[PDB]
Amino acid sequence: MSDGNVAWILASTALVMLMVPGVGFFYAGMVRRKNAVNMIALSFISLIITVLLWIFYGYSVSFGNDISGIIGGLNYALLSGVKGEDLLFMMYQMMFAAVTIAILTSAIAERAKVSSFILLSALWLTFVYAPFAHWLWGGGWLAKLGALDFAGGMVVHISSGFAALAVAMTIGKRAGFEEYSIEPHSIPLTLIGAALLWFGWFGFNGGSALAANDVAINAVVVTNTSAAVAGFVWMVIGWIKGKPGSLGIVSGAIAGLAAITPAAGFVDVKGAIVIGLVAGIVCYLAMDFRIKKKIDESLDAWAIHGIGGLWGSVAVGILANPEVNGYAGLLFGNPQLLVSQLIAVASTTAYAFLVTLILAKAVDAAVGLRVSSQEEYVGLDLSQHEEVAYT
Amino acid sequence: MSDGNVAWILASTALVMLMVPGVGFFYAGMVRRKNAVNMIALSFISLIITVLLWIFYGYSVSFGNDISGIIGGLNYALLSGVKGEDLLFMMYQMMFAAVTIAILTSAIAERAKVSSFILLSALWLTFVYAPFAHWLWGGGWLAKLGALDFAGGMVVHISSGFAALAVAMTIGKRAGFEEYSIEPHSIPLTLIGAALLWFGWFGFNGGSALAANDVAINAVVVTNTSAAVAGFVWMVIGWIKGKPGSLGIVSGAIAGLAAITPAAGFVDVKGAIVIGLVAGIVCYLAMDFRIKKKIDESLDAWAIHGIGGLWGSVAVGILANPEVNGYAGLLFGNPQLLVSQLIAVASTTAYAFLVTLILAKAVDAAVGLRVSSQEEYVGLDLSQHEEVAYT
Amino acid sequence: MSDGNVAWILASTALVMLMVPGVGFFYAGMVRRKNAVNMIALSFISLIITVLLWIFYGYSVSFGNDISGIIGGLNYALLSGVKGEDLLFMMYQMMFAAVTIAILTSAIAERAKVSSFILLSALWLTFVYAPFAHWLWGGGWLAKLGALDFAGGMVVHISSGFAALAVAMTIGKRAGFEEYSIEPHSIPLTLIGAALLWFGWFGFNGGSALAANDVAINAVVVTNTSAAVAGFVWMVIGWIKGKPGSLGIVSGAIAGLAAITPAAGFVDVKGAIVIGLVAGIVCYLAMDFRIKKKIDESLDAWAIHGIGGLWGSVAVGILANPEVNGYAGLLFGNPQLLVSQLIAVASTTAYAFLVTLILAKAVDAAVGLRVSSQEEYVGLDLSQHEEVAYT
Numbered sequence A, B, C: 001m002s003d004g005n006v007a008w009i010l011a012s013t014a015l016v017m018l019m020v021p022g023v024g025f026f027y028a029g030m031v032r033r034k035n036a037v038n039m040i041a042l043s044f045i046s047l048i049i050t051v052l053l054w055i056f057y058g059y060s061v062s063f064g065n066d067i068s069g070i071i072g073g074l075n076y077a078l079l080s081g082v083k084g085e086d087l088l089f090m091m092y093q094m095m096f097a098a099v100t101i102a103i104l105t106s107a108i109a110e111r112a113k114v115s116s117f118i119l120l121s122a123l124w125l126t127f128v129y130a131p132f133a134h135w136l137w138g139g140g141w142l143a144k145l146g147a148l149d150f151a152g153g154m155v156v157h158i159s160s161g162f163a164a165l166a167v168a169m170t171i172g173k174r175a176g177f178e179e180y181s182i183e184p185h186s187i188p189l190t191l192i193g194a195a196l197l198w199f200g201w202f203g204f205n206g207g208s209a210l211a212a213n214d215v216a217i218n219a220v221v222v223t224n225t226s227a228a229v230a231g232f233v234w235m236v237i238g239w240i241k242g243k244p245g246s247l248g249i250v251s252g253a254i255a256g257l258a259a260i261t262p263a264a265g266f267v268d269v270k271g272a273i274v275i276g277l278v279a280g281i282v283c284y285l286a287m288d289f290r291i292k293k294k295i296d297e298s299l300d301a302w303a304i305h306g307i308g309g310l311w312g313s314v315a316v317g318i319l320a321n322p323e324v325n326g327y328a329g330l331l332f333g334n335p336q337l338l339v340s341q342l343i344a345v346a347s348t349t350a351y352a353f354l355v356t357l358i359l360a361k362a363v364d365a366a367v368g369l370r371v372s373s374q375e376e377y378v379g380l381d382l383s384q385h386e387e388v389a390y391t
Helices: A003-028 A033-063 A085-108 A114-137 A153-171 A187-209 A214-240 A246-260 A269-292 A301-319 A335-366 A373-378 A380-385 B003-028 B033-063 B085-108 B114-137 B153-171 B187-209 B214-240 B246-260 B269-292 B301-319 B335-366 B373-378 B380-385 C003-028 C033-063 C085-108 C114-137 C153-171 C187-209 C214-240 C246-260 C269-292 C301-319 C335-366 C373-378 C380-385
Strands: none
Touching: A003 A033, A003 A085, A003 A187, A003 B003, A003 B187, A003 B214, A003 C003, A033 A085, A033 A114, A033 A380, A033 B187, A033 B214, A033 B246, A085 A114, A085 A153, A085 A187, A085 A301, A085 B214, A114 A153, A114 A335, A114 A380, A153 A246, A153 A301, A153 A335, A187 A214, A187 A246, A187 B187, A187 C003, A187 C033, A187 C187, A214 A246, A214 A269, A214 C003, A214 C033, A214 C085, A246 A269, A246 A301, A246 C033, A269 A301, A301 A335, A373 A380, B003 B033, B003 B085, B003 B187, B003 C003, B003 C187, B003 C214, B033 B085, B033 B114, B033 B380, B033 C187, B033 C214, B033 C246, B085 B114, B085 B153, B085 B187, B085 B301, B085 C214, B114 B153, B114 B335, B114 B380, B153 B246, B153 B301, B153 B335, B187 B214, B187 B246, B187 C187, B214 B246, B214 B269, B246 B269, B246 B301, B269 B301, B301 B335, B373 B380, C003 C033, C003 C085, C003 C187, C033 C085, C033 C114, C033 C380, C085 C114, C085 C153, C085 C187, C085 C301, C114 C153, C114 C335, C114 C380, C153 C246, C153 C301, C153 C335, C187 C214, C187 C246, C214 C246, C214 C269, C246 C269, C246 C301, C269 C301, C301 C335, C373 C380
16 A cells, blocks of 8 residues: 555644644633633543544545535444545544634633533534535535645635634623733743644645655645745734734744645645735734624634635635646636636635534524633633643 | 655654653643652653663563563663664664653652662663563563553553552652642643643554554554543543543543553454443543542552553453454454453563562662652752752 | 655654754743743744745755855756655755754844844855755765765754854843843743654654665664763763753753764764763763853853764764765774864864854844843843733
């Protein structure tokens, strides 16, 4: 099976797994000390829950027998019939689902009931993520009409970004959100998360070629490129607006990473530069806009992932270079690919937001999403975990 | 040599190395601020010491010429005659020894003399670890009677777990251990350790197939499975008993990882589920029991690793699936394998505990294990390292 | 292309990337709380800046058409003409440049203008790093006269070490440097950095064979060996001088890692032992000496990397074992190799220091390197990033 290829995907799988708690640390540093444990705990729970559901039926529903091009059957439930390298694919994919759910925790920072997050995550995974994976990567209707998503610009970034937006609006602003700014308790903790995410993204985008070949090498080159450009952009904006805080820098780098994900295996270095440059700009604008509109989509999963993933997914249709991976975009003489991406982006963006909104409200009405005011006041570490982050 | 296979083991080696300080961070967060540096420092020392002894003679004693099936000769001392991929095996194995010693530091948390830990570690490595590795993986008498241990359920988890129990009883309870509970100074630090351990375990269990093949893929699948189940279990117990603290969650995940280690390459996903489920339960019971018996085996190396490794090692004899890796357990028609595991588990459990006990007391009588009361009072960071963790 | 080999280098690339922020954490823990964000931020900026310049022309200047053996042309500017595995080489090499620049941040700890660091880094990369890479690895005049540097004893360690010395002397001592000692705000943060650096060095030295073969395995064995020896040495010195602080231990391990880098693929385990032993000693002496001379080369990039890299690079000429990788040193009957190393070390040491000195003063005169006294007083987190590390 080419031990080399298995080697690379085994490694890439470990890398993506690390990104789950990586997300937890990244977010934890930006919340208050009284909610640090909760923010990290959520990423671990996301992992645990994801692994179980994925095995149970998640994998089957995403990549099993296709039914009307919208979803898969239960032929792979409990991994029945999954052998050899399909098992490696399953495991690798399982980690993409886990990171997505963790990113989503951005919208419930500092005020959600853990039990409720679990219920909603299980439902979201079932009714939003699995479907997307199937549409694009499981031979679903989107792949059928020619849509492409190399590493998850849509399956992962658009889904969590817009789902995060829907969730934030449903759960409401944190107490005092509007009055005074919420300061991060540990920027260094966040920076550790950021280093783990950049590092893990090597397996995320580079592993998506499913082999140790020229496409993975390209994905690795362009991934690092877009990240650097988008990070540089936020740095400049930082200076333009005052001082370049470390948060803006890494946030910019992450915008570039999310934007390049859907295209990592189709574009050249020049294309990666445009994507990163534009990503840095539009994502920063989205942040200020959601801030202007007073939406407490707390850690900007939407501005960064939602908008970054949306852009990158569209950019695939404009800059795909056939010399790179056969596929060609508008600038390389193919208008058709652009239309496929727009349809794919319009569909996944609307569905992620609208369905998440339905799910969020359903659960809210069923069990209630938000913690009580006093718990929010004392912090979820104590109230939801009966723990104290530091002594 | 299949560059793919070398690639995977080179990577798996780096992964296991990371687990050493990973253990240090995991433990450090659960001790008091005045002992944070010491707890981490111990894991680095474990690494340094292990590497030296392993090269000097540790490797030879573990995998050299067999003498009476209990130990190896000195033909590989200073790596004399070790070439090509035997060198990669040596290096990979060296890291297993280092992690084991680090896990063991659980029993001496906050009150041991560094110099003494080194002496004892050197002796333990020599008289307990090397022998075990040889019995099971060096063509020793246990492998000879058909015993199996895929990734170290016995060589690593049972050994450190029970050795930790012996050490704790010999060194005694921390001052005030019984009166008031000792709070962790940094749960987030512990969670970083936990993420590094989960991530590193990909190389630990996945690398144990010694190749990038179907067995490693299986080991990776089942490893993640058992961890998720055992973590889910502790989460439920947490709710049943109040609130699911992040510590219980990751502690549960680690119980599943330790339990699955001896079996990662022999069982199917259904088997992994049973192992994780049972592991979560029995390990939690072991924790409460050692707590009930007032034994200051501080960070539960015993409850988690000892008991988790014991269970998993036995489970190998019940659930080994021949369709997975040829070997078959009791449930797959082979009673013989179960007997081999019981004998192996009875032997390694008794030896680890009894011999460690002899070694711990010997050193105690020779140089003294525990620091003075005042050092314990001011903290080992200052007293043993003349450092202060934070300012 | 041997998927195995690509697999290993893709992984090694991710590993070296991690070492960049790893350096940031390592350094951040040793500075004051008011400068924690700045110290880490610098490592991320180093990465971002490096990636951009490397793509733009850095790579071409290092490995493009040779001009008079001192530098490369612009034929690979913007990666024009770089395809297949040359692209993987490019990306892997790009990360070596990034780590070098991060190491260098040691000399400007707590008192530099970010804008100025960027300018100087861009110039240093252009006029010092690229040239070195070309001399030794780009078919430059040094490789031509038979000089060797397996993983960068000179290209990375000597360059940053001596450049750091030049920079420190040009920027001046931190306020109060002489009066009272500057305490590290978070040793644990530093220890996390150290674990990431040790782990990442697997890709650094092990990946330098450019394939998953016997040389990489050897590099991995010897790398871990020298680190352990040098760390053990500093530990002993620590006891001899009082208590073995964790900082000395990891600092010693890093001396061994830097010393072994230029030789990782040419020496045997016995040679690795001598190198580590000597490295621990000479590097510790260099630290005390620069401390005696009152030079605020803050985090000892010079004592550790400069001197460690200098030693190891020379040691290559004494201990290269032909049985290991064909090349042979003085002790293996070849005086010639020793002369090549001395010339290479004399040249790179003098150039790094002298040219960096010119660059540092130029920029200082152009825009000014150091922040104002009051910024230094309130801390660069607030003054240069308008952020606060912890709340």
